[PDB]
């Protein structure tokens, strides 16, 4: 459609299906997450983050991005080196994996913001605004799933303190990616490179349930 936020919705219809579909989120859904399944996606998000904000602080002062930067709301690596700290332990720098499918998300991040900055809008929208939306009801799932402290240690990750209202939030976020000065070109290939950063989890999800069945 005309808007961004419009056009990446409808662009992203089928693989966000996929995503919700897919063998590992599948069980997640309905009260079936396995700790050790939980450590390996938390594990592999953390590496996904990091490289992610890393891109996105490098490229903070620039017109293709920087309306969507939100330092104190949305950015993660924070909260995920907490729930490292709590799941993998003190030494959990060098105890954590990091699976292939892992240093694949974490290579294009760092193409993208490198050399393609105009694109980085995707990857952010693709998981940003999945931990507001997808991500708010599997804290609870998980908390349970796993009996977790009434506190939220483990769960920092779906926290989001700098977030009152996470549903106004969305539609603000939503308005800030509309400002976005670009071409119909690009905007296609940004639609586009949002398909890829779905793919990039979705692969990464059929994965990590085939490393835990082995």
């Known amino acids: ?72 709301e949305l950015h993660r690596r924070a909260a995920l080196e907490q729930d490292m700290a709590f799941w993998y332990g003190p030494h959990w720098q060098e105890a954590i994996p990091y699976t292939p499918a892992t240093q694949h998300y974490v290579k294009r991040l760092h193409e993208v913001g490198g050399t393609h900055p105009e694109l980085l809008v995707a990857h952010a929208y693709t998981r940003y605004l999945g931990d507001l939306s997808g991500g708010q009801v599997l804290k609870k799932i998980a908390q349970k799933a796993m009996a977790l402290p009434s506190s939220g240690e483990g769960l920092a990750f779906f926290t989001f303190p700098s977030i009152d209202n996470p549903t106004k939030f969305k539609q603000l976020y939503r308005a800030r990616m509309n400002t976005l000065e670009m071409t119909p070109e690009v905007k296609h290939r940004v639609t586009e490179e949002a398909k890829t950063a779905f793919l990039l989890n979705i692969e990464l999800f059929e994965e990590l349930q085939a490393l835990l069945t082995e």
């Open 1 to 72: 459609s005309q808007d961004l936020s419009e056009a990446l919705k409808e662009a992203t219809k089928e693989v966000h299906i996929r995503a919700e579909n897919s063998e590992f989120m599948r069980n997640f859904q309905k009260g079936q997450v396995s700790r050790e399944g939980f450590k390996l996606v938390m594990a592999s998000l953390y590496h996904i983050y990091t490289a992610l904000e890393e891109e996105i602080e490098r490229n903070k002062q620039n017109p293709v991005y920087a309306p969507l930067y939100f330092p104190e």
